[PDB]
Amino acid sequence: QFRALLFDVQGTLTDFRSTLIEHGLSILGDRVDRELWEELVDQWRGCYRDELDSLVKQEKWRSVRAVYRDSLINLLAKFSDSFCATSAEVELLTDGWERLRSWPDVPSGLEQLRSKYLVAALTNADFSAIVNVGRSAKLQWDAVLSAQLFGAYKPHRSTYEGAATLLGIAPSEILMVASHAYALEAAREVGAGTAYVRRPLEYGPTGRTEDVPDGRFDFLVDSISELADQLGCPRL
Amino acid sequence: QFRALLFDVQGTLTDFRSTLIEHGLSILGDRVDRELWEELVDQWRGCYRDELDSLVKQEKWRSVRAVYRDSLINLLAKFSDSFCATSAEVELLTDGWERLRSWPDVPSGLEQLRSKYLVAALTNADFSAIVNVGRSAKLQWDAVLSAQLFGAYKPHRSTYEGAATLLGIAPSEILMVASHAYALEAAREVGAGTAYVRRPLEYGPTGRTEDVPDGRFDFLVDSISELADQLGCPRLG
């Protein structure tokens, strides 16, 4: 009954928090302590989510690379007593979001799924960022979709339905996979299946998440390969 | 100097002619002999090219599955004295263009290129067809681009430059790979590199090949891995 699985990428398939922490400490040396940089990374992600919320209200799309770059410039001025960055380093730091590493279950989970389903990315990141993330995270897709293709971010209905028509299948034949409830709820509005992936470390050891009970979505799993088993995909 | 290679798919990476010939003979049984069906397949390809030519001159885009469907309906009326097809069979025959098998060099050639470059399809086929062709032809891409995304077919400039914008690179950082000269000449007009792959059997054993001289395009090869070697990509194990 499903033909394709569409995936959230940042956080759902990739550990962006550990990636961005190590990336920044690699670019900036002992100019910044780990505790301060991790705090910057958490506010960076928060800045990103807040700007996308405003843009969704405004019915606007804008390059997400620019969203990361501009919010980082803002944070760099706020933390300017503790450390500084040249313009070149700002570009290298922003590049960290295009170098996300994946959770360990992800590459083999996707391969297990492909025996029965098309697998495609549906990310709010720009098209070039998700292509680059495919290399850093070792993701091999049937197709790569981005908000850039549709002029709107998730949860907007044109993203899910544009994905379905591009893929030539019915929305009810799409299973949306995510670690973010808001993206599953939005796929539900257009008729797609829902699969929630719990990522307890998406926001680090002291992170908090709205809890998801069993039965709220069609599937509730702790890895992509667990999802593949519950969908009937043979192992290896 | 290049960041990404963009590929023509039908014919350049896939043997569409053998695919459609065997596919049709499987769906239609003894209703059609091989010789007649091969001639229909050849006219089917010609109608597709003629219709894309017209739409390009009109600056219009249309679904390519519908181009294939409508041309087959036209051909079925021209051959209607010899055999017929139900509407269900027309759908099944049209699906043949979404099941293309690749030339034998293509999977290991694409894998060899990825050590140094992004590789992406840039096809005039619809997005869903190129996604399906990835399975039948075992193509593994960094991204899939279609004329459907841009509202225009190659050779129009909005396809190559739209591809470059999506990939976050300059048109001059793209190497266009194709077995059709017209798609290379148009990529050159936007500043991209050109790589011609000779496919002597694209049109069958007695088919006519474009005869490309040396010096016309940046690269002239007989396989994707030969192209990968000339681009400095390390060999596969």
From TrEMBL, chain A:
Superkingdom of the organism of origin: Bacteria
GO MF annotation, one: hydrolase activity, acting on acid halide bonds, in C-halide compounds
Alphabetical keyword list: Hydrolase
Keyword Hydrolase among UniProt keywords: yes
Residue ranges that the Swiss-Prot or TrEMBL entry lists as coiled coil: none
Protein name (record): Epoxide hydrolase
Species for this entry: Rhodococcus opacus
Encoding gene per record: eph
